[PDB]
Structures are given as C-alpha cells and as structure tokens.
Design a protein around this ligand. Structure first.
Ligand code: HEM
Length: 293
C-alpha cells in the first residue's frame, strides 16, 4: 500500500509568512480585475486548487496536492486542465516574490485565498507540501468527465474519499466563473454572480427553468432562460434522490453550505498528506477587508 507524504514546514516560516503570501495573492486578485470579462482570476484559482488536488488516488496515494506536480508538462498539458495556465501565470509573480513557498502550498493557498476574498467561508489551510520530482506527476485522465450522470459522479468521488454530502458541497463551487467553449466544450456562466461565493448553485438548480440543449461544440448542457448553464454532471445532483435532498438543504441554509464547503475543501486540499503530531495547527487567514487593506 501507498506512498507516504509527510508535511514539512518551509524552514522557519509561521502564520505571518503565509498571511503575507495570501495578501499578495488577494491584492493581485483585486488589481487584475479585468480577466475573463471582469470575472477576474478568483474562479480560475479555485479550479486550479481543485485540479491540482483532484488527481489524488486514495488506493495508492498517487497524485494529490502534495507534490505540486502541475508545474510539469504532462500535468499542465492535461486536456482536463485547459485554461488553468492562466491561474499558473497569475501565481508566477507571487512565487517569484515568495520563492520559499512550495508549489503545492502555493496552488492550494491560491484556492483558499480566492474563496475567502470572493466572500466565501474561511478555509483553514495547512502548510508543508513539498515539491516532488517530475516522475511523480500523475498521468492525465484522473479528473472527472462533465457529460455523465449521478452514478458516475458518486463513484468518481469515492476515489477522493468524498461521500454524498462532501460531493454536493464541493460542487457548489460552480457558483463561480463559467465554462469556456474552447477549454472544455461547454459554454456559458454557471450563475449570476460569477465572482462572489454564495449558495446560488443550489438555488439556481432548484429555481431556474432548465432546458437540455446542444451547444456549439455539439455537447449537451442545461441552459436556463436566465442565461445560465449547468453541466450534465451538475444537473445530475437534482436527478438523484439522495443528492437532491442535500441540494435542497444547502439551497435553504447558506451557513450550513459554507461550513460544509470549508471542511470538504480543506479535506480535498489535504488528501494524501500526513501531518506530524507536532505540526502547526491549520492557519485561518484574515481577508484584506478584515485587515483594512
Ligand atoms: C463532477 C465534478 C466536476 C466536473 C465534471 C467539473 C467540470 C467543469 C468544467 C467542464 C468546467 C469548465 C471549464 C472551462 O471550460 O473553463 C468547470 C469549471 C469550474 N469548476 Fe468544475 N467540475 C467538477 C467539480 C468541481 C469542484 C469539486 C470544484 C471546486 C471545489 C470546481 C470548480 C470549478 C470552477 C471555479 C470553475 C470555473 C472556472 C473558470 O471560471 O475559469 N469544479 N468545471
């Protein structure tokens, strides 16, 4: 059984150091507001954090956030990762200012920072991801297909040790951003507020009038009269009776959805990492707004 990946704190660093990195990311989020027709870089950094963590296989502990392997061509050229190069470019000048942070820690922190700055829940975050060599890069094809049903989604996420509630909560990130026809074969914003984190993914599934249409890439997606879109895999969460209960739950309780997302998101970003008994506790970073910055 599995590789063991032990978190090792960047030498001599503590909370204040990582807050500084969070702050640099958050300040650039605010400065580079123009990206994607004023959506900005928040959604793409969340997706980058998810895709670099979502390669994890619980059976042998390959993939995962630990190794920061997205920096290698095999993984950055994963067709599943198309468009994430923009997030990597965003983070370039951050990594240059703080060259002491590991790539794993930077990608996952990017995602925490974007969620919190887009007014989502606090996500405790732990340091100590260590860059691993190019031969540790997971092969392509570990991230999920969008054209599939609820049974697919349930089985898919068992590999990442997520249960129904964790799956439904994580999928609420599709409040954020949009599909881009050239990136994935799907096109259109997921919701109304593309760069504000809310439970609107659940309210939209339940409340909008959805039509199954073919987009310009000849792929089926669900389109609402409002101008939103959901993937077949999104919509499957209201087709499956067990998912649909959880959807209705988060639709009706913003705070529960926040708490559940934070835990599931932290878990996702931490799968495969052994934290020593003596490792520091998880950091909860203040937002710029909380700091008066
Ligand atoms: C069955 C599971 C999932 C599937 C099939 C899926 C698939 C997709 C696809 C095809 C796109 C559009 C990519 C593009 O064209 O730009 C997308 C966007 C996005 N996904 Fe997911 N996703 C899944 C779960 C997740 C999770 C678990 C998260 C994070 C918690 C997440 C975060 C995002 C974000 C933020 C975007 C917007 C990216 C942007 O606006 O640039 N997704 N997803």
């Amino acid at each position: 059984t599995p590789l063991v990946h032990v978190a090792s704190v960047e030498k001599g660093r503590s909370y204040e150091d990582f807050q500084k990195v969070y702050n640099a990311i958050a300040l650039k989020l605010r400065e580079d507001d123009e990206a994607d027709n004023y959506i900005g870089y928040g959604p793409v950094l969340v997706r980058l954090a998810w895709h670099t963590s979502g390669t994890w296989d619980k059976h042998d502990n390959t993939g995962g956030s630990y190794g920061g392997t997205y920096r290698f061509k095999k993984e950055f050229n994963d067709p599943s990762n198309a468009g994430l190069q923009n997030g990597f470019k965003f983070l370039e000048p951050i990594h240059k200012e703080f060259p002491w942070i590991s790539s794993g820690d930077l990608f996952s922190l990017g995602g925490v920072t974007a969620v919190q700055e887009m007014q989502g829940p606090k996500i405790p975050w732990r340091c100590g991801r260590v860059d691993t060599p190019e031969d540790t890069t997971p092969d392509n094809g570990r991230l999920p297909d969008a054209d599939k049903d609820a049974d697919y989604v349930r089985t898919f996420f068992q590999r990442l040790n997520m249960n129904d509630r964790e799956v439904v909560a994580l999928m609420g990130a599709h409040a954020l951003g949009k599909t881009h026809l050239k990136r994935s074969g799907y096109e259109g914003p997921f919701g109304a507020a593309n760069n504000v984190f809310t439970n609107e993914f659940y309210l939209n599934l339940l409340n909008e009038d959805w039509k199954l249409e073919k987009n310009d890439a000849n792929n089926e997606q669900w389109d609402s009269k409002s101008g939103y879109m959901m993937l077949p895999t999104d919509y499957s969460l209201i087709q499956d009776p067990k998912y649909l209960s959880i959807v209705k739950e988060y639709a009706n309780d913003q705070d529960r959805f926040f708490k559940d997302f934070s835990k599931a998101f932290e878990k996702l970003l931490e799968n495969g990492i052994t934290f020593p008994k003596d490792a520091p506790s998880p950091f909860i970073f203040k937002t710029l707004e909380e700091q008066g910055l």
